[PDB]
Amino acid sequence: SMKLTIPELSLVVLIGSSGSGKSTFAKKHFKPTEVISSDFCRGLMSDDENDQTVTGAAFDVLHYIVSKRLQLGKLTVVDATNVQESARKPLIEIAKDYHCFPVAVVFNLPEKVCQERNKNRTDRQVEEYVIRKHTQQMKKSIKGLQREGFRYVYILNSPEEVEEVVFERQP
Amino acid sequence: SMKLTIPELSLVVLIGSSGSGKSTFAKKHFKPTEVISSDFCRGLMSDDENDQTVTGAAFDVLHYIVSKRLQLGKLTVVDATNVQESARKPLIEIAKDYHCFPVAVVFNLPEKVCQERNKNRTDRQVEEYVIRKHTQQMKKSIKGLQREGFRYVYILNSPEEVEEVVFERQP
Numbered sequence A, B: 001s002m003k004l005t006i007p008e009l010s011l012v013v014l015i016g017s018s019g020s021g022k023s024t025f026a027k028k029h030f031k032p033t034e035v036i037s038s039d040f041c042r043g044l045m046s047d048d049e050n051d052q053t054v055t056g057a058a059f060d061v062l063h064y065i066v067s068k069r070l071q072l073g074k075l076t077v078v079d080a081t082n083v084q085e086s087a088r089k090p091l092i093e094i095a096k097d098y099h100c101f102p103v104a105v106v107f108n109l110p111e112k113v114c115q116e117r118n119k120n121r122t123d124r125q126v127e128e129y130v131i132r133k134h135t136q137q138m139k140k141s142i143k144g145l146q147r148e149g150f151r152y153v154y155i156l157n158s159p160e161e162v163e164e165v166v167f168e169r170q171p
């Protein structure tokens, strides 16, 4: 088993391409209310799943929901791709503002694993170019995560490592 | 600053090429008795400086001293190159046996930084091929550290980041 230590009051930032298994992971390890996803926040703005003008407002809504939860001292998991630095930066700022530890959990899986899961999804799919781009962005993000302000950086390098994770909420 | 969190019962394993600044780092951040260097244990075996004929014995003594400190529940920093898995593995096993968290602090500096510092050392110097080898070994080691059993893995990627380091002990 791979034991990942997280403080009782953390902002757990999931980082991974579409299809990397973020939401599945979040569901397996955390309570439903602890998880705030970008899909959920987009849904608050538009019942139209494919509306792109909504993304900006949806990020604002996600950041604000996270802020209020953390302000209440409630461990929160951000279930979004988070492969761009510009997406991670305000999350880290939020964590610092409410004196929480930002934790990075990176789904460092090969692009082919993500592409294959995507092809087999029955809930919703993305285009292949999206996952190609996400994976490149994820890879380029890894080295710099600690310096970005993540207090603990956990890189999961394979599906088996992902599957072996157990969180320890000691601190 | 770069805040690195360690539990008060930690085995802190410094990982880095000769000349990467491990001993300098250890002296800056820890008490002298918390730090056990391979050089010190070598000195217990031989009055000659950096005697290479007693290496096996020196590391045996290091392992023994480390395990006795952990046994007494004392935080210990292992100040050796630790760029080989075979050197790290017994430290991890010792930590496990004494219910201590092994922490990796990796000096991921460019080879040229270590080569350059080496030529200006007053205590002792190594040949260039040694530092080239150490650096290759260190870089190969990074990805697998968490899987090896290190609970926290902190990678320092430049002298500036090494400089900014502050430890936060959680007892």
Ligand SMILES: Nc1nc2c(ncn2[C@@H]2O[C@H](COP(=O)(O)OP(=O)(O)OP(=O)(O)O)[C@@H](O)[C@H]2O)c(=O)[nH]1
Residues within 6 Å of the ligand: A016, A017, A018, A019, A020, A021, A022, A023, A024, A025, A080, A081, A117, A118, A120, A121, A122, A126, A159, A162, A163
């Ligand atoms: N076998 C296996 N399948 C998985 C695992 N994680 C996810 N999957 C499958 O991969 C598909 C996508 O997983 P999600 O958890 O939706 O991926 P995501 O990272 O949330 O994707 P986006 O929401 O598009 O960013 C699902 O159909 C899952 O069945 C896993 O650990 N093992």
Ligand SMILES: Nc1nc2c(ncn2[C@@H]2O[C@H](COP(=O)(O)OP(=O)(O)OP(=O)(O)O)[C@@H](O)[C@H]2O)c(=O)[nH]1
Residues within 6 Å of the ligand: B016, B017, B018, B019, B020, B021, B022, B023, B024, B025, B080, B081, B117, B118, B120, B121, B122, B159, B162, B163
């Ligand atoms: N300018 C500067 N010099 C440093 C720094 N850290 C170490 N040095 C110098 O680099 C040289 C080697 O540093 P050490 O701490 O002995 O390196 P080490 O990793 O212990 O090397 P070994 O014991 O041979 O494995 C010394 O001359 C230090 O003074 C630093 O942060 N800044």
Ligand SMILES: [Mg+2]
Residues within 6 Å of the ligand: A022, A023, A024, A079
């Ligand atoms: Mg999802």
Ligand SMILES: [Mg+2]
Residues within 6 Å of the ligand: B022, B023, B024, B037, B039, B079
């Ligand atoms: Mg030294």
